[PDB]
Structures are given as C-alpha cells and as structure tokens.
Amino acid sequence: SIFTYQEKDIYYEIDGTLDINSDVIVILNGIMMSTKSWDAFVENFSKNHVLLRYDMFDQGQSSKIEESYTQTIQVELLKNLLEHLGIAQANIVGISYGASIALQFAAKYPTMIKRMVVANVVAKTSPWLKDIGDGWNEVAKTGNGLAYYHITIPYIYSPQFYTLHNDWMEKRKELLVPLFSTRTFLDRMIRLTKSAETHDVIKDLPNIKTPTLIISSEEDYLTPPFEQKYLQEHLQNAELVSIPNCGHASMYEVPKTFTALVLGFFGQTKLDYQI
Amino acid sequence: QGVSIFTYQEKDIYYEIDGTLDINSDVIVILNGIMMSTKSWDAFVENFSKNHVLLRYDMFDQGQSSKIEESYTQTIQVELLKNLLEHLGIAQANIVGISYGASIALQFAAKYPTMIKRMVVANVVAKTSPWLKDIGDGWNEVAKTGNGLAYYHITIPYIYSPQFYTLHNDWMEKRKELLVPLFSTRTFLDRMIRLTKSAETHDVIKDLPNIKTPTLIISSEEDYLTPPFEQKYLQEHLQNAELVSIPNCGHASMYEVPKTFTALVLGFFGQTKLDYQI
Amino acid sequence: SIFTYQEKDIYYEIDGTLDINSDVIVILNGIMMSTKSWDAFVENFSKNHVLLRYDMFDQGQSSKIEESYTQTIQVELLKNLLEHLGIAQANIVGISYGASIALQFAAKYPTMIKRMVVANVVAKTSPWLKDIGDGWNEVAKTGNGLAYYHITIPYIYSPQFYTLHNDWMEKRKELLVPLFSTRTFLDRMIRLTKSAETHDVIKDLPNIKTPTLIISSEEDYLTPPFEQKYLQEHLQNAELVSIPNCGHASMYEVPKTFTALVLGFFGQTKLDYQI
Amino acid sequence: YFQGVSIFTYQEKDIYYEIDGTLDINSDVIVILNGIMMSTKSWDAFVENFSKNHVLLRYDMFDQGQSSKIEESYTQTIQVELLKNLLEHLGIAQANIVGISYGASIALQFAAKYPTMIKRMVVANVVAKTSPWLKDIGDGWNEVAKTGNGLAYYHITIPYIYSPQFYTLHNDWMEKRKELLVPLFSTRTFLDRMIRLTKSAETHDVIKDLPNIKTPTLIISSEEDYLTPPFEQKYLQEHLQNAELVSIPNCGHASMYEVPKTFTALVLGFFGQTKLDYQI
C-alpha cells in the first residue's frame, strides 16, 4: 500500500479490515525501525484492533527528504495519513523517535487520539542527547558501518541483555554492519537524527490531557528514566511503568511486557476508578 | 444457604461470578489479600470481566466465608482454590493474586500447574522472611489487645506509599474513621491473627525452578511490606517470569495505580501468544 | 560528668582533651539512642578529634521533661552545652531524631558549626511519618514492650540485614523487650516522638550555607530516600550519598561506611576543588 | 641516566611518577591508579587533601601521560607487574590503593596476585570482568580512533563518561573542554595509546579470584554510570567478602570529577580509619 502524500510515496501496512467500526492502533516507529520491525507484534496487536503501521519520511520503503526538516513534517504526515484512511481517532503507541512524534501530535491534534502510550521518550532533546546525535552523524558521515554499529547498538540494549543474548547480537551484527555501511541508510539516519534536535514539547505537556502510559527502562542509556519521571509529572493524566534490567529497546528485551502494557492500557473499558 | 455459596468441608465459601460461565469461558480468578474481600475488587469488575469470566471468592477467615478457629497454614487455602474451581467446572484459569493471595497463587502453581493458563503476582514474596514474620507478630500482638486505633496506625501507613498517603491524606482519614471501628471488632481481629499466622509457613523456594507457569510479577518501589528485592529474587528463579516495577507506589498497588494494575493483568492474559519471534 | 542546665541535669561524655583548638565532633543521638550507643565509634571518631557525646532531654541518663515540648528544647540544649564547654564551633553529626536537631541548629546557630553530616533525615515530618509515631505512642501507652518491639525495630533495619543477622537481632531482642516494657522508657519515647511532630525546616533550607553531607539508606522504611533527595536539592552546599541494602540504622548495618563518610568529610582540609 | 628524578627505569622504558610528601618505611602511603584517559596531573585537585596525613604516590601506567609508549600487544598484566616493581623500587612494602575505571581493574588484579602489598583498597566505577557489552563499546572507540577523527572520537566517548544531568548543567564548560580535546583526540600518538589501553582491558577477568580477595575493600558506585553500570559493582561486593558498597546518585562514570568532595571523603575516611572492626 502507498499513500501518495505531498510529492512523495508513503508506505503503510494495515492488519485487519479497516472500516470505521473498530479501534485503530497506530505504531510510530523508532528512528532505526520500519514496519517489518513490528512483525512479531502484529498477531497480538491486531486481534481486537485494526493495526496501522507506516514508515515515516526517510524511513524504510517510504521516500526520501533531501532538504532540511524538523519532526513537524512527520507530525503532519501522521495526521494526513489518518485522514487519508478515514481514521477519525486512534490509539497511538510510539517509541524513541516515534514517541517524540506522538507527544507533538498529542500537542497539536488531541482530538485524533483516544489513548497514547509512549516508550523510551524525552520531553525535549537535551544538550547531552544532542551531542550523542552529533556523534552518530559524524561517524555516519565517514561511511564506516562497523564503527557506526559499535557506537549505536550497545546503548540501544541494556548491558545485561547484550551479554545474555550475545549470540543473538552477533548473528544480527553480521548483517546490520553492512546495512549501516550503505550510504542509503546512513544519509537517512543523519537527516532523521538532525530533525530530532529541535524536539521540545515541554510547554505543551501541561495542556496534553490525553490519557498516557509512560514506559521507562531502568538501564536506558539514551533516554534515561529521569526524563520519563519529568514527563509523568507535567502530563496531567500520565501513567508510569518502569522496566528493571532493560535497555532503550524495551520492545525486544521484554516483548510480553511491552504488549501487555499497550494492549492493557488501550483495552481498558473505563479509565476512571471509583476507589 | 447456597447460591453464590460453595459448601466445602461442612463450611461455607462465598464467591461471585461476573459474566456467564460455560466450558468455552476463559476465566480470571482473583486471589484476595489478607485484609481483602470480594467487594474490594468491585472497581475492577467491569474491566476484568469484559472479555473474561471474573471469579471472585473469599478465602477462609475472609469476607463472608466461614471461619477456621483451628490452627492452619496456607495449604487449606490452596486446596480451597482447587476444589472451588472443580465445583464450578473450571479446568484451567488465569490467576491474579496480590500479597497473601499472591502467596496462595505460587503454592497453587507448585501443586496444580495444570489448572493455570497464565499468572500475575503483585507484591509477592517467595518465602516469609524472619523480618516479615516478626512484623506479623506485631500486628497480631496489637490485634490481641483489641485496640483498633493502634492496629490501624501500625498497619495502614505501610500498606500505602508515603507519597500517596500524604497526597491523598483526607482519603485516608475519612476511610480511617470507619476502619478503626472495623479494626476494633474481635472477630475481624481473630481472623487477622489466624490469617497472618498462616503466612509464617510460606515457602516455595524449592518449587521455583519447577514452576513452568508464564508469570508477570508486579513490583512496587515503595513497598515496605514485600520489598522489590523479594520480587527480583522470584523473577530470577522462575523459568518463565517477567518483572515490572511501579515507581512511587506502595504495597497496595491495587489502589494507588488501578490503571496500571488493570493494564498489566488484562494485557498479560489478553495476549494471543506469549511466544515472540525476535 | 554532668551539665546542670535549665533546672535539670544533662549527661555528657568527652573523649580526648578539650582545647579551644580542639577539632570537636558532636554526635546528636537518635530517638532511641544514648551516649553508650556510640561506643563502638569512639576510638575512630576521637583520634584526630575530640568527641562530645551527650544525652538529650528524655534520653539516656539525662533528666526527664514531663511537660509538653518540641524539638526547640533540644536545640537550645546543644547551644548551651557547647557554650558551657567553651566550644565555639564544632563538626556536628546526627541521625534520625538528632539529624532533625542538626538542621534546626544549623538554621539558628550556623556560626557554631564548621561542617555537618546528617543521616537518615527529613526536612519536615510528613503526615505519613507522624501517624507512624502515633502508632508507636498508642502502643507505648499500653505498656506492652513485646508489642512495642515488633512495631518499631523491624523498620529500623533493612529486611536483608534483619534476615542475615537474625541471631544478632534475637539476642538483643531478649533485652530490648524488657526495656521497652518499662513505663520510664515508654514515657520518654512518647514525648520524644511528640516533639518530632513539629519538625519543619523547609523555609530554612535555602538559608543554610553550612557544608553538609547527607547519608541516605535505600531500604529506609522510616525516613525514605526521597526525603533526603529533597533535602540535598534545597540545601545549597549539600552532597548526597546512598547506601544500598541498608536500613534506617546506618551505624549498625554499615559502620565502616558511616565512619568513613563522617571522618572523611570532617577530615578534608579543603572542600573547594579546582576541577 | 638513572639520575632521572621522578623517572623509574623499568624494562628499558621510562615510568613517570610523582611523590607528595617525604617517603619512609614508617610512611603511610596512598597509591593512585589512573583511569584510561588520565595521568598524574589529573589528580592535582586531590593532592593537598590526599597528602595531608599520607604520602601520595601518583604514576602514569604504560601508554599513559609521561611514561614510555608500548608498541606491542599487551594485556593489563604488564600494568600489574609495573605497580609491584614500582612499589619495590621506592621501598614500599604495603600501601593503600585507590583506583578508578581502568586503574580499578588493575587494583583488583593486583589484589588478586599481591595481596600482601595492600593495606586497604578503594575501587570506583569498577567491573569484575569486561563484559561482551563493554568490549564492543571499546571496539567502537577503537574503530573511530583508527580514522583519526578527533571530533567523532570526542562525541562517542565523553558524553558517556559524565551523567546526562551533569553534562547538561555544566554544558558550556564541556564545549570549552572540547576546543582543546578535539585536537588532542586528533593526534595519532594519543589515539594509538588509547587503542592499546582499550584492547588491554578486554582480558580483564578477576571473577576467578574474588572469593580469595580478603582485602578491606570499599566500592564506589555511580547510579548514572553508563560504562561501568551499578549492577557490576553489586556483583563485586557480593563475591568480595571484605567489601562495602556506596552509591552516588545523579553521577556518571567520572565520579571523581562530578562529586570531588564525596570521592575524597570515602577515600580518606576508609583509609584514615584506624580499626575496621566494630563491636556492635
């Protein structure tokens, strides 16, 4: 499926029959993710929901953006995509980069969101995180896929996970390094990383009344828990959940947990409790 | 005496079923805490029983079930659960327990693992430490005096987190002026003493490497009764266990974070397949 | 010897030779403590320092105050005791109840403190903490030392410590219970607990420039770490230290660490680092 | 010559060392084991406080500071034997040892082989073994260092040395560090030293020796340490039996730099203690 949005082609996948009948779950990908990266979650996510997966600009099978852009064009992408598919409201679950989009999207179009689940998410790109991005880009500008791997992924996963499932890491390392060596992937990553520099929804938080459940990884070395602790206080109806011994990629480290929180929060009939 | 009443060993067991129960039903059974009854889960009935058949019951010395004046461990609560499930024609069930109920869930999963599909344990220990045991001796000792005011003050501020206790203090005070009378009646105190003493023998450490039951452990960071290091121990010795920590939350995760508790329970039971191909 | 103060006798102990050129370390006792409860620390504490230990009102071998009193009585006791001994300025270290006294003292007489080390300390008695104190008092009124034991002591130590050294607990238990059963000990505890109800130095915290090192126990179920976190943020020159797997009684669980923190902070020649 | 003052001729190579105070057989000595990016001058701020009641011994290990280079593949073994022979050179029988990061690894190995030459020990931001995780991070540093890019090398190392809070709070201070560090990180000789020091840490493994280390140890752990995480310190503390653990909230891998008062208090306090045995 292709959403001819603006001048470019936007790739999206739909699991389940989309008619106005059912609740939609929209997945907002991380900066290194595509639609196929959520294949393991499709069956569980689309049993009582219509699952909407799509690749953002400069992602996966979607077209490129060779000009300077912030995360704004990704937010407008999400709105126009939903309007294209005739989706009035939807449950939004985003992670990392996608989690940043969801917060911006909840700040501009709250009437298109039922409930929201953000994982491994900051309210604003700190000077610390920005310099990390400059590190990723500078290494990507050399075209060294081996170097680019060894500086990104050990901080995506917790040290415990990387060590425990090291053979799993190595087998994936043999193919990720060639992927990280291609100028196609890297140039897309550079652009996607620069766009995240201007991420700032701090002054939008006290006005986002969208029911939110925040997932926090204790061993997240990219978006540390203190950033999630901040988010939960300034969001009015925010829920917080911490995942012990887990890195920035909670999706893979604890898939049963991730799904439980997402399906559980979206699946609740009532959210107000009479206790 | 009997509808919503299960006569068992010439004694009455009160229970409630929400939804219609047949052979197709996917059941969620709730194992109560040491101070809880079926009515304490009223706020979760609508959500838990939307796509499930909610089975709530009161254990011995609990709620509106009969009393047990003879000394007893938690083994009679484990057999109770089996015979109750058999009585209602329930072969398998999803078990969610908390505190005392979570201890019954573990002992049950060790004895009758075939009667469980999935399990969620919240604020749970694998074994009653000498620390927790002496805390119980203090609860009992004050209960032995009949002082309801004293009993309240030495139990409840440990049920909840300091932050929640402070933030919702007037929710604690209006709920206190009726708790103190409850804590002042002997029968309730007598039930509390026998239930607390039944937990002294909680020990499933040897059973942990054998429990193949898919389990989600709920941990509270500000739990001053069943501390996080206990759940961490449980999640390491169980073969198929997952751990979740709730920041700024007391022993009563049921009441402090009802949204989270529901999401985790419904989410873990509602998953089609726990096998992820990563 | 004895310090006749304020109508009444105050018991104190001095280790070393007292000069005005003395490096004095004053220890502010916990609510259940006395001078005899710091004996194990005496040798280390009084090697390069002159150690002053004293029993506060309703404590140890000091007289009783049957009248209703707050912590401001203990505060004036410390000042007058120091003036009595001719001590102008001294390093003050306190824990629990004594640590609360230290804060009220540092806010009223900052010129009589060189450096301060407070352990297991809050800036204000929370409604939660006070209702705990009401529980202690309400049980203390029944005279049941057996009941009074099991509702106080297991919360003073961490579960790990109480379990690992249960023999150490049980042998002390056979002595603490007869002591907790005396009306003399209980009446003192009740009044010492009632005085701790009015603890509030929140307003004073930004005005305390006294160099402070805050000790916090992760498994403190009485004065939790978040209260220390609050303390370290609103004191301009305060450093924080967290002790893993430790309870409200730092001294007995980690005596090597406690003394290292106290001696190390006081022993430091210069606190300002060109770094 | 051997009239080289503050120079120890070892295996036909020059080892630089600095001593604050005067040395004696009676002298109470503190030996500092540097981090992987550190030298003797990296401890200047601590000199006055550390040498108050102790004889401070600072020295640069191989491929560090002012000491000679190594252009052979070496493990941390040559760093351990260096410490032993340096101590013997100065006539030091026993000494208190404080080590951080890389030097902390040397301390444990030294405590594993020569426990008689240690009085008391302090280790900060320390692992009991180089994990496959920590090892692949080092490969990342090495890979980037190979390119000679100083700007890239800086951005992939230092943000993980300091805590995110600290790095943001004292940010403009970090960027003026950067104007001087980027050229330093661009020099081949510096990068080559960093590579060989990194490769040497790959074979760090003292799990074998932990239950045999009876040395009075105080472990300093940082909560926002993203290179030697807290869980690694908890492991060390449970398999060492004369070990105590202290945690530093809101602090990164460079604990000494973020909390200099705290670091000093723990070191001076744990060493300056006369008798460790408490009758409680």
C-alpha span between D123 and D97 (Å, rounded): 8
Is C175 in contact with C149 (CB distance < 8 Å)?
no
Is C275 in contact with D257 (CB distance < 8 Å)?
yes
CA proximity to B25, closest of B73, B99, B89, B82: B89
Is B130 in contact with B227 (CB distance < 8 Å)?
no
Is D271 in contact with D122 (CB distance < 8 Å)?
yes
List the subunits that have 3+ CB pairs under 8 angstroms with D.
Answer: A, C
CB atoms within 10 A of CB A233: 11
**Runs of H (alpha helix) within chain C:** 42-45, 72-84, 97-108, 127-140, 145-150, 153-156, 159-164, 166-180, 183-194, 225-234, 250-253, 255-267
Domains for chain B: give ranges and CATH numbers: 1-278 (3.40.50.1820)
Helix (H, G, I), strand (E, B) or coil at D216: coil
B227 to C245: CB separation less than 8 angstroms, yes or no: no
- Find the discontinuities in chain B where C to next N exceeds 2.5 angstroms and give the residue preceding each: none
The pair phi, psi for residue D170, each rounded to 5°, is -100, 60
Is B45 in contact with B86 (CB distance < 8 Å)?
no
CB atoms within 10 A of CB A59: 25
CA proximity to C263, closest of D13, A201, D275: D275
Is D96 in contact with D54 (CB distance < 8 Å)?
yes
C-alpha span between A74 and D179 (Å, rounded): 35
CB atoms within 10 A of CB A256: 20
Measured between beta carbons, the chain C residues lying within 8 angstroms of D269 are 259-265, 267
b/e B127-136 (16+ beta carbons within 10 angstroms → b): bbbbbbbbbb
CB-facing half-sphere around the CA of D280: CA atoms within 13 A = 17
C-alpha span between D15 and D20 (Å, rounded): 17
Is B118 in contact with B94 (CB distance < 8 Å)?
yes
Chain center to CA of D68 = 18
Is B44 in contact with B262 (CB distance < 8 Å)?
yes
- Find the discontinuities in chain D where C to next N exceeds 2.5 angstroms and give the residue preceding each: none
Which residues partner with B14 through β-bridges? B5
* Chain A / chain D CB contacts < 8 angstroms: 81
CA proximity to A244, closest of B236, B258, C244: B236
C-alpha span between B10 and B8 (Å, rounded): 5
Instruction: Tell me the Cα Rg of chain B.
Output: 18
Among B129, B132, B145, B154, pick the best mutation site for testing chain C contact (most C Cβ within 10 A).
Answer: B154
Strands (DSSP E) contained in chain D are: 7-10, 13-20, 29-33, 55-59, 95-100, 118-124, 217-222, 243-248
* Chain B / chain C CB contacts < 8 angstroms: 81
Q: How far separated are the first and last CA of chain A, in Å rounded?
A: 46
b/e A91-103 (16+ beta carbons within 10 angstroms → b): bbbbbbbbbbbbb
Burial of D51 (0-12, 13-18, 19+ CB in 10 A): middle
Helix (H, G, I), strand (E, B) or coil at C113: strand
CB atoms within 10 A of CB C194: 16
The residue behind tokens 């029911």 is A211
Chain center to CA of C212 = 15
CA proximity to C90, closest of C170, C12, C179, C185: C12
Run of H or E residues at B101: helix B100-111
Q: Tell me the C-alpha to C-alpha distance, in Å, between residue A18 and each of A25, A37, A53, A88, A92.
A: 11, 21, 13, 12, 16
Total residues found in chain D within this entry: 280
C-alpha span between A108 and A106 (Å, rounded): 6
Chain center to CA of C189 = 14
The pair phi, psi for residue A31, each rounded to 5°, is -65, -25
C-alpha span between C218 and C230 (Å, rounded): 14
**Joined tokens for residue B193:** 């003493």
Is C124 in contact with C130 (CB distance < 8 Å)?
no
CB atoms within 10 A of CB D188: 10
CA proximity to D53, closest of C267, C46, C25: C267
C-alpha span between C139 and C137 (Å, rounded): 5
Is B217 in contact with B245 (CB distance < 8 Å)?
no
Q: Which amino acid is at C207?
A: N
Q: Which amino acid is at A267?
A: G
C-alpha span between A37 and A33 (Å, rounded): 6
List the subunits that have 3+ CB pairs under 8 angstroms with B.
Answer: A, C
Q: How far separated are the first and last CA of chain B, in Å rounded?
A: 54
Strands D13-20 and D7-10 come out as: antiparallel
**Joined tokens for residue C154:** 């297991």
C262 touches chain D (CB under 8 A): yes
**Joined tokens for residue D141:** 């540093």
What HEC string does A145-187 produce? HHHHHHHHHHHCCCHHHHHHCHHHHHHHHHHHHHHHHCHHHHH
**Joined tokens for residue A133:** 């991005």
Helix (H, G, I), strand (E, B) or coil at D211: helix
B147 touches chain C (CB under 8 A): yes
Q: Which amino acid is at B176?
A: K
CA proximity to A104, closest of A51, A38, A28, A23: A28
C-alpha span between D228 and D234 (Å, rounded): 11
Is D37 in contact with D4 (CB distance < 8 Å)?
no
Strands (DSSP E) contained in D191-253 are: 217-222, 243-248
Run of H or E residues at D172: helix D171-184
Torsion sign (Cα): B226, D250, D210, A165: positive
A256 to B219: CB separation less than 8 angstroms, yes or no: no
Measured between beta carbons, the chain A residues lying within 8 angstroms of D139 are 150
C-alpha span between D2 and D14 (Å, rounded): 10
CB-nearest partner of D244 from C213, C256, C267: C256
CB-nearest partner of D45 from C251, C262, C273: C273
Burial of C181 (0-12, 13-18, 19+ CB in 10 A): middle
Is A194 in contact with A125 (CB distance < 8 Å)?
no
Chain center to CA of C122 = 11
Is B190 in contact with B97 (CB distance < 8 Å)?
no
Among D48, D264, D271, D276, pick the best mutation site for testing chain C contact (most C Cβ within 10 A).
Answer: D264
Measured between beta carbons, the chain A residues lying within 8 angstroms of B46 are 269-270
CB-nearest partner of B153 from C135, C154, C157: C135
CA proximity to B48, closest of B200, B242, B275, B261: B261
Is C147 in contact with B138 (CB distance < 8 Å)?
yes
**Joined tokens for residue A241:** 């959940």
**Residue D232, min C-alpha distance to chain C (Å):** 13
Nearest chain D residue to C172 by CA: give it.
Answer: D280
Which residues partner with A8 through β-bridges? A5
Is D213 in contact with D189 (CB distance < 8 Å)?
no
C-alpha span between D153 and D142 (Å, rounded): 9
DSSP assignment of A27-49 = EE--TT--GGGGGGGHHHHTSSS
Angle at A217 between CA A211 and CA A221, to 5 degrees: 125
**Joined tokens for residue A105:** 């999207």
Q: Tell me the C-alpha to C-alpha distance, in Å, between residue B273 and each of A40, A44, B267, D209.
A: 10, 7, 11, 44
CB-nearest partner of D249 from C242, C255, C273: C242
B255 touches chain A (CB under 8 A): yes
Chains B and A touch (3+ CB pairs under 8 A): yes
Tell how many helices (H) and how many strands (E) occur in chain A.
Answer: 11, 8
Angle at D254 between CA D253 and CA D259, to 5 degrees: 115
List the subunits that have 3+ CB pairs under 8 angstroms with C.
Answer: B, D
Strands (DSSP E) contained in D107-227 are: 118-124, 217-222
CA proximity to B99, closest of B113, B85, B69, B120: B120
**Residue B1, min C-alpha distance to chain A (Å):** 31
Instruction: Tell me the Cα Rg of chain C.
Output: 18
Cβ-Cβ contacts under 8 Å for A156 (sequence gap 6 or more): A32, A222, A247, A248, A249
Angle at A52 between CA A49 and CA A53, to 5 degrees: 135
C-alpha span between C148 and C167 (Å, rounded): 20
Q: Tell me the C-alpha to C-alpha distance, in Å, between residue D74 and each of D53, D70, D103, D177, D197.
A: 36, 8, 15, 31, 8
Angle at D59 between CA D58 and CA D65, to 5 degrees: 125
**Joined tokens for residue A221:** 């070395």
CA proximity to D216, closest of D239, D240, D236, D248: D240
Is D221 in contact with D250 (CB distance < 8 Å)?
no
**Joined tokens for residue A89:** 């409201």
Total residues found in chain A within this entry: 275
CB-nearest partner of A241 from B47, B246, B270: B246
C-alpha span between C95 and B22 (Å, rounded): 61
CA proximity to B101, closest of B189, B26, B41: B41
Run of H or E residues at C11: strand C8-15
Torsion sign (Cα): C142, C143, C144, C146: positive
